[PDB]
Amino acid sequence: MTEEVIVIAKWDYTAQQDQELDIKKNERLWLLDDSKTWWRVRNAANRTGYVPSNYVERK
DSSP: OOOOEEEEESSOBOOSSTTSOOBOTTOEEEEEEOSSSSOEEEOTTSOEEEOOOOSEEEO
């Protein structure tokens, strides 16, 4: 079973692909995998995708 990581974005980031999800400056995202350069995340909209949101801090 994969472990989920709870983090909060500090700056707005735009998805680099159509399968990824856009985030905001103060938007909380649900990470699924941070081992890869690209991180998989989930949103309150029930959508999930891989976004290398380097502009996010763990909390």
